[PDB]
Amino acid sequence: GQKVNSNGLRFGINKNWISRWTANSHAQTAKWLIEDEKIRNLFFVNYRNAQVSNVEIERTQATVDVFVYAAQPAFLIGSENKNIQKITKQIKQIIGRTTNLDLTINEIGSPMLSARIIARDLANAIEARVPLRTAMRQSLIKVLKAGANGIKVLVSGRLNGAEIARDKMYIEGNMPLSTLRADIDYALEKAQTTYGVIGVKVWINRGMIYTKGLNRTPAHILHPQ
Amino acid sequence: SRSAKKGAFVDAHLLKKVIDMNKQEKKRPIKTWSRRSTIFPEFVGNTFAVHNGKTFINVYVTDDMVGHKLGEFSPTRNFKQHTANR
Amino acid sequence: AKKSLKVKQTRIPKFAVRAYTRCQRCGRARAVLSHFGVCRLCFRELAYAGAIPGVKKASW
């Protein structure tokens, strides 16, 4: 049957909001809400070879703050800090010159246990005609060896160019989805294939967080050893 | 219904045409799309071609039609007989 | 015929009553939340990702 979005079910209990701002009026509540979607979508669609896992936006009456975590920031940084200025001009045009931008590219710890880059890597393999079984098995084994809990990958679509759509799942461990105290990270990606669209869904379990707080601390962002 | 202070309503394009048309003796049908304009005393004696949706049906105003709407004296849909489904 | 309707809605009309509110991400006309300028089915994606601050699930 249908399941509630795993990320959306855990909001306001253990996970904070990716955008934290208070607008003036219902007209400024819409502009400040559509603009950040453009900014986030910009970051994710293009500038992808960097493995950006999550981008949070912080705005006040007039000051916009962006916190961008990535696995390979060299592509954002560019040659002797070139691409960074370039990307800055895009962001300024989107929100407006009248404001102040404060990009804060932060390197990420524990890159594996983030559902965004894993889903992006899974999706990338499918456009390159890589066999699905091998691609999925190889990504899971590196992820499992990296030291996390169970991962569930669902890749529904016109699998392998077929004319009848299927779906393949691969669970490996205890993934208690009905439980609220678990630290489950969820992300979704669209693999654009020559034969259509492939939907890849990745559930990752990153332990148990008895914390009653909403984020308030780096999750997989933390850099352990 | 319509308030008093506001009064009546014509598009004022019809008024210029109507004033011009009353001065000119050889009056001809007025092709108007404005069904919202109310029939004003000066309209009396003229003939109009109101847009029913497809064509312009001709209505000859009299000393009596004054007050109603110019589109009220023309139809929009037509129904005259059903057909046994069975 | 969606983008042109979206563009026409952005453009100011010649009468005030000619102005309607469309969703700002997509182009859906009906079921638009004036509180957010976002239609009902865009609100799910924003609420389920944390883009909208303070939007948590409700239990009553």
Added chain:
Amino acid sequence: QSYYGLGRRKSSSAKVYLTPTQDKGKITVNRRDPSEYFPNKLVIQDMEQPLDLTDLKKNFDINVVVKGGGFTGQAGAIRLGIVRALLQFNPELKKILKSKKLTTRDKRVKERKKFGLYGARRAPQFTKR
């Protein structure tokens, strides 16, 4: 030595003040006659349900302040408030009051309306054919 009780029922608070007296209890609700405040029915006695079987001859002067609810909810609130005030003067009464269960919050409040339903528990008419 006054006594204070705080009852509640159907979202209706109550502040009942028990004052020792020997010149008839003269029950009073919000500075107005209870026979004028409440309906002329057993509810006016429902309020005396814990004050009758034990006693009212001790002539307790009643000072009721209720803010919220209808009238049955207010009556239940002062009953709980009165009984809670009764639990500060001569603790055996508690035992007998406990028996009849007149010293427990009723815990009954109106449920929340649910989507797709015409009320708390009702549901739309079903048409199969």
Added chain:
Amino acid sequence: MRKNRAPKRTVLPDPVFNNTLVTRIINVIMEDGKKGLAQRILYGAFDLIEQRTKEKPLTVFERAVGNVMPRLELRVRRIAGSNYQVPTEVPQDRKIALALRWIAMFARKRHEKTMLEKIANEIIDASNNTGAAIKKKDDTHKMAEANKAFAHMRW
């Protein structure tokens, strides 16, 4: 299948006449969830009984309800279809309830005026075992007596 009888809403205390049955019949004549309206109807009808019968209203009411009170109940069992009405002894709790329920249906159908006079007339007509509620009890008793053969028959 249920195999469980959870707490049966138990209440009895009555004030004006100390007869639990008065509260039950009040609840029976209840309509639209109006307690005050039903209370006025019963108490005014009881007041109407003082000027007519010159006797205690509770005594006449008990004399009426006990007289209306039935003995046999005809239930439903399957046999090639339909049911050959089986007479069974209904318990006392249901027994009073059915008696009170029957009183209300025939009281709200009398040719009389305000149900005050209607129910008073219905009740006064039942203290002498000659009324509309009696006929129903008479009919079910007569229906049960004819079908005594299939009585015992139980699943």
Added chain:
Amino acid sequence: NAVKYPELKIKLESYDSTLLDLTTKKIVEVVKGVDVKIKGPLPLPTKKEVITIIRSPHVDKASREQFEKNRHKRLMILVDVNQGAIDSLKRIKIPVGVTLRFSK
């Protein structure tokens, strides 16, 4: 000694609760480290808004999910501040989520 501002009635409100309590704790701690008599961090009723939206795009109006958004609110009125407290007031800082309604 001076005042220059009598009866500073600071009002706090935010979509989040714990941040609001934390922010109220920091302001109160600083304002008592200087010589000011805090009236008290009292809570005001929280205005909760609820929007009911059908999840599906096309059919099944009966199955409709629901959302709520609470704007937690607090009140705090300061009697006398003076420059000696104004400096702390300035370098106090407040996490974005929390919203202030200083009314002077």
Added chain:
Amino acid sequence: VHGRAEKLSGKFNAGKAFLENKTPKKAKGKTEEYTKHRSLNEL
């Protein structure tokens, strides 16, 4: 025996006076100012 006319005519006179009066007083709003979010009065 007026047969309508006079009374509806007066309404028409009011409307024609309205139409010839028409002044382009196009506007969109009412109450104004007091629209802000405050700050720490200088941060």
Added chain:
RNA sequence: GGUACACGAAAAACCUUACCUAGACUUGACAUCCUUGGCAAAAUUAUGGAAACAUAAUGGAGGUUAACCGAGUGACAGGU
């Protein structure tokens, strides 16, 4: 069918609108890429107009082209 029928639609006079009748347009009302300039688009007042749109006006924030205003230009844009 249950699991459609106060359903999509949490608001069809105009708008919405996707439909019909008409009056108008063609790298187009919107977009990028390219050779090339920016010394505007608006809004509003006139005349003809059912209104689209035309012919005339204040020639317009700004910032020297930033964004856009254009020309040239074929890949194309577009389709509820």
Added chain:
RNA sequence: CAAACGUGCUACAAUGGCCAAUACAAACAGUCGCCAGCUUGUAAAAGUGAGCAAAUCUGUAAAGUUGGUCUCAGUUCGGAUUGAGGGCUGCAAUUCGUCCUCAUGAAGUCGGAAUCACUAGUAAUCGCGAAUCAGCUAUGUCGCGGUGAAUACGUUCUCG
């Protein structure tokens, strides 16, 4: 629009209709808004005009209590339909907005075969608020409170 079905509203009534006085909520919402009070108006409303960016100001609670009247009738039930005069929104209300006042007063007197919901603050019922919205016979939808029941012996039958 000759018709048929589904979901709701209003009723066929003295557990009521009409008139007067009057007590008791919760939740939510509000600066192109909530609109107090005052003046005019048979009324919808208009003008003046404070107060409230809100536990502060505003959004009349109704059923309920008492008194008067109606006396079982197609009625002081029931409001449809129709005609006229007004008010509001909006360029614009005829196709196709709603409100008020006057005028009229269809059917309907408990509804065939057959069916639906509900196990306590539940069914029934009385109001209040919000969303989209310039305005809208939304009687719809999502919520909030006031009053507030009856029954469950049992699984033989019935559906899953």
